Design a protein around this ligand. Sequence first.
Ligand SMILES: Nc1ncnc2c1ncn2[C@@H]1O[C@H](COP(=O)(O)OP(=O)(O)O)[C@@H](O)[C@H]1O
Lengths: 371, 111, 56
Amino acid sequence: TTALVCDNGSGLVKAGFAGDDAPRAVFPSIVGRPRHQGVMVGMGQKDSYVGDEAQSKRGILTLKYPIEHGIITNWDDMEKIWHHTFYNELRVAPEEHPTLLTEAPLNPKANREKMTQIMFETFNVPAMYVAIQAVLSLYASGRTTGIVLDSGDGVTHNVPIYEGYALPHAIMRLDLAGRDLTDYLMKILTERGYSFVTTAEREIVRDIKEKLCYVALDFENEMATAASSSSLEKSYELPDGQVITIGNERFRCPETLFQPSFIGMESAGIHETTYNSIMKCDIDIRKDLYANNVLSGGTTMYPGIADRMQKEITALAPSTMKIKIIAPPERKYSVWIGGSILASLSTFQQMWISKQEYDEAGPSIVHRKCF
Amino acid sequence: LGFTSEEKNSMYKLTGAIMHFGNMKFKLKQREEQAEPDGTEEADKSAYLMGLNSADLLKGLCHPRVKVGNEYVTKGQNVQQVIYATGALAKAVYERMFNWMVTRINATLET
Amino acid sequence: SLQKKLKGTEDELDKYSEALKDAQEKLELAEKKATDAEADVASLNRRIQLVEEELD
Ligand SMILES: Nc1ncnc2c1ncn2[C@@H]1O[C@H](COP(=O)(O)OP(=O)(O)O)[C@@H](O)[C@H]1O
């Protein structure tokens, strides 16, 4: 039999089969409901659209995300998401397939327990397993040591691993990610008159971010370059027409990752939490960690982010070590790729949580050595 | 046997292309983990034999594209990975030509 | 028409990468040599002070 690999993430569902090179179903993790009245009798319209259909009916729906920061907040919505993923995108019967789920470090425990309970009671899968996103990223990267920085859409986290041993006291988790970058871009785009307030203009702003934003290698020099020239100013065409022109806020948006004070957060940038995780690890694995700094997740896809991260970590660490940043082109799907590798490993077929184990030990069996 | 002289010619040249695959040379990039070709001459001649473009085959070996849902994203490769891919390609094309030759033989024999 | 520009940039890039590699090689070489020479001179200098107090 084959196992499914559902990388829920927070803002993009990625599912597929264990043993493939890529997911076969990538769609947004949104659930939309109509907000207007509806006049044409016989239209027979539905009450809630899931996934990629909601993005077509944006102008009529209110789009809600069922996952805020890794954490699931709307369990009925999330159950709809899973039902859509199993039956409409993949077209499989979940009572014949083990399912490997992913989760971020340092989430509530009820999240994981309720996820297991759903997967066994509602969808009736034979086995299931919840994996950490950073470990799976390291599987897909081909390493066995290295400090991984998995910046998704809800959370950002560093997880240092050495020789296959993870150092839990050095795990860092930050709640700044692509969703906060989108909100900051919505906010600073009002300096030029453009206003995006609806829950469906957030998708337009996310598209603008993905297509035009980039990380500056030096922030003050790019500030001055934008103040003087106009060579970095680019245009974008809305779904309506009426092109908008983006100036220096092409690189002020992702700079929030290195200066979280822009959105009023207290914490330090990703370049500094990475270094603090290093310095919290031992002394005789720090050289390997410096040399194996692995990036994954969608928020690491900006142009120039690897070069910026290297410049910063190099200015932080001692001057005698080679600091190297691994940033594959298929970063966004690294967690899923690693999940497929892991679930196909023949050694892993004894780590599943079978259904009988659950029936006899309750949902608490998730936090056991299968953690 | 039933098959023409052009077909024997193509068989021989295909085997020579398989032979030309082995001498390809790849190096890591400047400050990255990506494979890039340094020697291009055997690449050019193997492409001229195979009926493909040399730059296009080199790009297809260094930067595969995979399907993620409804989009294509480029996958990264290092020297070991591209070498394993080259070997698997050669084994595949050889075994394919072999099976098809057996099909041709059986078609000749067929009553 | 810009493809010639692209190719020329690739060529100068390759040249600069080879240059950087050679400079790193010479750097690490000379640095090993300087460290080893300093080790030797410090050792033998301490030995000189020891034979000096010996003479005293
Ligand atoms: N090319 C890109 N540049 C900048 N941000 C991107 C790019 N592609 C995707 N993103 C951001 O990544 C986020 C999705 O990341 P993802 O890896 O899907 O995490 P998750 O699966 O947890 O949602 C989106 O919010 C989007 O804004």
